[PDB]
From a paper:
In an attempt to prevent ansamycin binding, we made the switch loop more rigid by Gly619 and/or Gly621 to Pro substitutions. Surprisingly, the crystal structure of these variants showed propensity to bind either 3-FOR to both L protomer AP and the smaller AP in the T protomer in the same AcrB trimer or two rifabutin (RFB) molecules to the AP of the T protomer. We assume that the Gly619Pro and Gly621Pro substitutions induce a switch loop conformation mimicking a transition state during wild-type L to T conformer conversion while the HMW drug is bound to the AP. During the L to T transition, the HMW drug accommodates in the AP/DBP region, mediated by the flexible switch loop of the T protomer, in an induced fit manner. The intermediate positions of the ansamycins observed in these structures appears to precede the binding to the DBP as has been shown for erythromycin in the MtrD homolog RND pump from Neisseria gonorrhoeae. During the T to O transition, these drugs are then exported via the DBP area through the O protomer exit tunnel.
Residue numbers in the entry:
A (entry chain A): 290 to 337
B (entry chain A): 98 to 241
C (entry chain B): 1 to 1034
D (entry chain C): 50 to 145
E (entry chain C): 866 to 913
F (entry chain D): 11 to 166
Amino acid sequence: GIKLATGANALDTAAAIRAELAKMEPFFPSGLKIVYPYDTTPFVKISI
Amino acid sequence: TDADIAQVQVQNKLQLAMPLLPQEVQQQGVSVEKSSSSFLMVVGVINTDGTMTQEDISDYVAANMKDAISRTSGVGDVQLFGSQYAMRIWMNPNELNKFQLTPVDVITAIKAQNAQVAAGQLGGTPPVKGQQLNASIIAQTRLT
Amino acid sequence: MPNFFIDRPIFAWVIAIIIMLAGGLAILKLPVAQYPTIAPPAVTISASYPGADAKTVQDTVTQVIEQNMNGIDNLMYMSSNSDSTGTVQITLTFESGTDADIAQVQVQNKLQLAMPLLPQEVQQQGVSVEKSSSSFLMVVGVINTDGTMTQEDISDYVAANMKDAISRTSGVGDVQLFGSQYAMRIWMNPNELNKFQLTPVDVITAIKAQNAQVAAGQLGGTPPVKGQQLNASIIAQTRLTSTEEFGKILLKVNQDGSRVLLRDVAKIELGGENYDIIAEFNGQPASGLGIKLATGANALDTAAAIRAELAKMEPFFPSGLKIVYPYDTTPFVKISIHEVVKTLVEAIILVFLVMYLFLQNFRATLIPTIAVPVVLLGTFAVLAAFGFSINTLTMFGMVLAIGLLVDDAIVVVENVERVMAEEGLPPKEATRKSMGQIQGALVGIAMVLSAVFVPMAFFGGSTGAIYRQFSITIVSAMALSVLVALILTPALCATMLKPIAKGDHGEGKKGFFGWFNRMFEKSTHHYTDSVGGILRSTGRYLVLYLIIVVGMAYLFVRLPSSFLPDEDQGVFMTMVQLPAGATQERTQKVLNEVTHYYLTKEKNNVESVFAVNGFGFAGRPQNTGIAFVSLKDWADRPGEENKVEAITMRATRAFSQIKDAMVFAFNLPAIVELGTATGFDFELIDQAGLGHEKLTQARNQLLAEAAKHPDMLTSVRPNGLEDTPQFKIDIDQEKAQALGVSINDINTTLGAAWGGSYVNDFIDRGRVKKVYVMSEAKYRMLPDDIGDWYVRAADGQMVPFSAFSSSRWEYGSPRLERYNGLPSMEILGQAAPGKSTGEAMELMEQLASKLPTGVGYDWTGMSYQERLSGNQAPSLYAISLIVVFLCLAALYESWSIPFSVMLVVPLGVIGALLAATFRGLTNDVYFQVGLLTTIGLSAKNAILIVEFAKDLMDKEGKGLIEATLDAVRMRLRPILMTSLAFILGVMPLVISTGAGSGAQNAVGTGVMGGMVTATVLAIFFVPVFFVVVRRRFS
Amino acid sequence: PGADAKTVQDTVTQVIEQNMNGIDNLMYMSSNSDSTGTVQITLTFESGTDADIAQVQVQNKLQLAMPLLPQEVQQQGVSVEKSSSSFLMVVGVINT
Amino acid sequence: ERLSGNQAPSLYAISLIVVFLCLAALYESWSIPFSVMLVVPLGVIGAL
Amino acid sequence: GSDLGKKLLEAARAGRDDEVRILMANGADVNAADVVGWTPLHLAAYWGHLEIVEVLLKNGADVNAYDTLGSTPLHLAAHFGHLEIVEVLLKNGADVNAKDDNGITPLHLAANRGHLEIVEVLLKYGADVNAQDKFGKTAFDISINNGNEDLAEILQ
Ligand SMILES: CO[C@H]1/C=C/O[C@@]2(C)Oc3c(C)c(O)c4c(c3C2=O)C2=NC3(CCN(CC(C)C)CC3)NC2=C(NC(=O)/C(C)=C/C=C/[C@H](C)[C@H](O)[C@@H](C)[C@@H](O)[C@@H](C)[C@H](OC(C)=O)[C@@H]1C)C4=O
Ligand SMILES: CO[C@H]1/C=C/O[C@@]2(C)Oc3c(C)c(O)c4c(c3C2=O)C2=NC3(CCN(CC(C)C)CC3)NC2=C(NC(=O)/C(C)=C\C=C\[C@H](C)[C@H](O)[C@@H](C)[C@@H](O)[C@@H](C)[C@H](OC(C)=O)[C@@H]1C)C4=O
Ligand SMILES: CCCCCCCCCCCCCCCCCCCC(=O)O[C@H](COC(=O)CCCCCCCCCCCCCC)COP(=O)(O)OCCN
Ligand SMILES: CCCCCCCCCCCCCCCCCCCC(=O)O[C@H](COC(=O)CCCCCCCCCCCCCC)COP(=O)(O)OCCN
Ligand SMILES: CCCCCCCCCCCCO[C@@H]1O[C@H](CO)[C@@H](O[C@H]2O[C@H](CO)[C@@H](O)[C@H](O)[C@H]2O)[C@H](O)[C@H]1O
Ligand SMILES: CCCCCCCCCC(=O)OC[C@H](CO)OC(=O)CCCCCCCCC
Ligand SMILES: CCCCCCCC
Ligand SMILES: CCCCCCCC
Ligand SMILES: CCCCCC
Ligand SMILES: CCCCCC
């Protein structure tokens, strides 16, 4: 559960998280996988 | 209001309280955070093969993923939906009473025998004249 | 605007005076330093665990702090070290533009909350959070000649009687003590302790009790009994203040009545806190003070103030104590200013001569002499407004701009002198018409040069920080030059210049000036005839143009890249590296031999040698050492043979003879806070808890594959240390519990004796200082000495350490590295001769993908900098070219004509590349900014030729070739005048071999060579470009 | 707590004061150490100085001195905050 | 109080020079500024 | 402490087979040692380099050489779970009942880290199962304390 820091940009922070998660994925054990069951940023990106 | 200064002012006062708090509360780590109450996103993690349990997945997220996300700029707070692993000593009162022991004796034993000692060096400074051997002394280490 | 200030010359003078006063005010107030803040904001968390091994430090301190470094803003990456000196350094590097104070306090605050998680011994020592990105202004060395003081004795005096007064000196940012103040050292004896049935635990318990502050209260304190007369504070036991008092600390009382004191079982003396460092200055014991310059402080004033305050302390020093200055950057910055002020004054003198050579009147020569200082003064005021300092980058930014500043003065005045000669108009009317011809072009040139230089400021990281210094300096200087050229210079021309008769070109005169005028007039006719011949067969020169463009592209790939030129700063370093497990004494003998060489062989060059044993920037084991060699003055070391580069190569070849010691001499980099910034910085990461051994195996696998490509990779070393033999001891719990020996008493006795133990504080002459208990050297050297230590059991019997312990040899890390929380191993290296860094980095990524499972990688330091800075470059080049085209298109009112101007770029660049290749220099930042000024002034010359050529065709209705020939005829004189002045102006910078010669050579060579080709080629090629472009697009 | 003015000056005041060096826009530094054990080190900055940045720079420099202080001083906690000498008002309270 | 007194002379100096240059700029003269700025002592003695 | 001897120690440690082969041809000192008293065979046995152990033994390396605390290469091979090297050493006459300064045999070290296959190999070559260390603890006493059911069954 990631909470946005006071004053920080939603889309930029969300992009920074996805970039850091992308570095981890290659070194996962067999079977383990990331899923995105809640995200407020896609609405902001698509609606604009 | 500048959230950077707000955090500094709040924590400046917390540091006056910190020593007056119980020792158990200090060792749990007090945290000062500047973030929204609501969640930006939930990064869920699952195993498709079903090789890892709920507890195993939470430990991996806590040990390999959580810290780097918590350090990322803009991330004000990270809540783990689970728990990192810890060495759980599940005590038995019947067996403790049989050998005439208490939780106090268990805690004393763990502190004594699960210890990381600073044991110094062979040929450490200041050395004697004509010293050839220089090596670290390794005593007790953390149990694995 | 020009017509406005011709009729109002006083208002023009007022604007000139305001700029000069604002500029003069700036020169007094402007900060002064060698270099500005270039390296990104870095915060190093430093802690100490006395007598702790690398893993103990990592697993109790480093990992705990790392885990609590969350919710901190603008963090790029986190790297940390944990080594067997019992030390941890966690460096958090931040985004460029981040507030270093906000960065430090956020790190400091998160550490404070993690302090209760650390061990008590680490909490007692405490953890320091400092800015590590800044560098030293000077290092003040303190020595003892008469040999009455040790390095411990000198360090204590510097801490007590000097450090505080140096810190309070004006402009001093930070003062680091090269050593430590005294510590009460209890040197324990196991034979004496066992004799009286005692342990190090008993020594610690007694010292804590008999040396401490005790709270008491007050006589007649509130609430009092009514009728109380006296109120006084009750003073109880205060801390001990002498070795004698510590000697009399009571440990035990025997039956017979004899008193067992602390001096009876230990030697007690004032010593150092740590004995890892042995600092010597030409053999004698030495300490020092590393002084850093404060923010917005004057480096010249601060250094003078430091020397002034050190002079006041001279009478109070003990016998034989002397101050020395091995490292001082102020002398270098003193020369840097003097040489730049000389260049600017010589440049104005050369303009005076060239202006008098061609125009031949004193009234004309005064106009540039007034105008150029007004612009240069104004530039300092604009730099002051932007919050810039007078530094090496900003100072050479002025020198590179001289070409543009000088042209603005000559172009305006020469054109007025020409109009008066050809048409026969009076000064005022002639200036109105002259300015009418160029006022549009001068504004156009301003916007073109803006589009060239402004995008240079918006590069990212350390590279972009340097490029920003040149950008703002040159754009500001250029901008004011255009304002002065449209406001002041026109007013000066209209008021000061004398009338010239129609068709008078000084051909009627005699002597030298009579000859020169007749010679130059015929030389102009020879030039017009030559251009006429060139314009008949243009096709042949379009082929010659492509040969230059191919020749340019060829020399670009051939010329090797670098960051900055290495300077002779009167100092260089000599690293000493013995085999692993080698002792402090063995390292000292090599340093003594290295010190002996420099004082014998290089006695004419070397002033002193600062031999720092047990010191190193990548860990501080006993086997590693370093020698900071300080040289004599630049005047005392004549020729190239007596320079740092020559002494380095002679020294390195001399010490290669020595066995069991890897010894190399090497010069400092330009920006010493940043480093070399040439090769690449690789991190190999443990991404799946493989461990130390498996990460070592993966590193050895990568190094082995790296060796198989000499053609791409070279000098590939790991930054870390190799595993070493360590004395593993296993305390048997059953045997300890059976004999009745507690594990606390065992681990304390071992830790305190062999490692040392910080007990409590004591007051030495009104100064709080640490009390350490440790074994005397001889009782903690070899494994056999383990058995000599006895611990008292519950029943009272003294059990030897051998009775309940078993020992063996194993291998472990003396320095464990971590990157972004996970374990890592840092790997260095550089691209092979011919290959770029990009190719070398790309191969390391390919080799990294074939390493075992759960082994990742990342780029750090300058590799991280260049990868983000590299992606921005294409966009900034594109924005520059597009806006330059658009600006020229608006000026000429044509989409096609701009191409005639922009085709000049290679003519200037080819000469710079030939001069750099011939002299054997690199493609450094000084060269790259040098190209832009050469391109800028060559583009400026072309703009006025095309403007004149186009205006003749539009207004006077002349033909293409007629206008082009008439244009280049009119523009020949001013282009030769500027070029003659500016080429002579930068000539001293090429031949310079003194202090700051590397930078001067880089600035001079590229500009001189570039300006020779830019002048010679463009006068012939700009005609061709204009006619070919005009023919092609109607 | 318990220490006299002289002991408090040597072990605390001088340890903090020596580390309060090269801070931005510092005009002067006044301090006093008393018999009850209290220290008060007031750093007055130039007019126009950001008091919040001034507070941060003082706090950063203090935590270098903090480890050199005694344990009893660290246990009480050292406060760093913006200050003024004079009172705005005195609100008095009585019982009728 | 010490700071106020020390910076007063330079404050008067620059203040006079700015007014002089502003009059020189506006009226396009040196004589008119010098003619005007000689009046300053007549006022200053009245204040004292 | 010869020039080639120091290079053989570093080569044997790293596991550079090609470099060791060249040093054996040039006549590098096989009985050379560091300060703790570790031969190339000690280092080769420790880091688990099978080829270099075989090459060193063929070039007259001391199989029963011991460090300053009395540990032989068989101790290091048995302790760190190198089954192949333990067999090669024992074939070349490695003392299976070699006591260090603490009385710890290779059987004790193999038992402690639960290397089942190595314990069987040591017992085959005649390891004294009732051998006691300085604290009077056998290989069986280590197995019951560690809680190893498989190892305790083998040490019958
Ligand atoms: C012959 O190749 C070695 C020379 C040794 O000789 C010495 C005496 O000259 C050196 C020179 C001239 C250096 O600039 C450095 C070092 C050394 C030496 O040690 C370092 N020494 C260490 C500290 C001590 N250990 C050595 C230990 C394993 C025995 C690790 C290296 N760190 C070192 C650096 N900074 C860093 O770590 C980082 C992060 C900075 C930037 C990295 C770049 C990529 C390099 O700076 C690059 C431009 C180049 O300098 C090296 C590739 C250098 O090769 C040359 C000269 O091309 C080798 C280091 C250096 O900048
Ligand atoms: C005379 O001192 C300088 C030598 C220059 O000359 C060079 C050419 O010879 C070097 C030698 C012989 C080295 O052994 C090293 C380096 C250099 C040089 O550059 C490093 N160069 C760097 C690598 C690049 N980063 C910046 C990066 C973000 C672009 C910093 C420099 N660190 C370097 C090292 N490796 C590391 O272990 C790293 C990665 C961290 C080191 C930590 C130190 C403790 C702190 O960083 C800081 C408190 C200070 O000690 C340095 C900054 C120091 O500067 C001063 C003012 O004292 C220079 C080492 C080195 O071991
Ligand atoms: C990121 C990098 C930086 C980005 C930069 C972006 C640049 C924006 C684009 C601007 C490009 C301007 C460059 C060309 C200027 C040529 C001006 C000459 C015009 C011309 O032919 O007029 C003659 C000369 O004019 C004269 O010389 C004087 C009279 C004309 C004054 C008005 C000209 C426009 C002002 C210049 C600045 C424009 C940009 C501002 C943002 C005749 O004179 P006339 O008969 O017209 O004279 C009466 C006025 N009515
Ligand atoms: C705290 C730090 C302070 C530091 C010090 C800073 C000093 C501030 C600046 C002071 C500036 C003073 C400049 C005075 C110039 C005197 C000119 C003498 C001539 C004069 O006054 O007589 C006029 C003749 O001028 C003419 O007609 C000739 C005009 C053409 C010549 C222009 C030469 C200007 C010289 C510039 C000096 C540069 C100084 C640099 C600092 C009278 O005739 P009129 O014009 O009044 O009336 C027009 C008829 N109807
Ligand atoms: C580093 C690069 C190498 C240096 C390159 C230097 C290039 C600049 C030098 C230009 C010299 C111009 O010199 C000029 O050449 C032209 C040839 O085109 C000659 O022109 C001659 O041949 C042309 C052929 O078409 C005839 O039309 C013309 O009537 C005749 O005079 C001129 O008589 C001569 O004065
Ligand atoms: C008249 C047209 C000239 C436009 C040139 C603009 C190029 C500079 C772009 C920029 O902002 O980057 C500055 C950059 C910073 O390192 O300086 C440089 O590296 C100098 C540019 C190199 C020469 C370019 C011509 C050769 C083409 C193959
Ligand atoms: C001692 C020189 C001080 C002024 C520096 C600036 C000169 C350009
Ligand atoms: C030369 C760069 C600009 C290209 C766009 C203009 C085309 C006529
Ligand atoms: C942007 C250039 C377009 C010109 C077409 C005539
Ligand atoms: C002190 C003011 C004098 C002014 C005279 C011009």
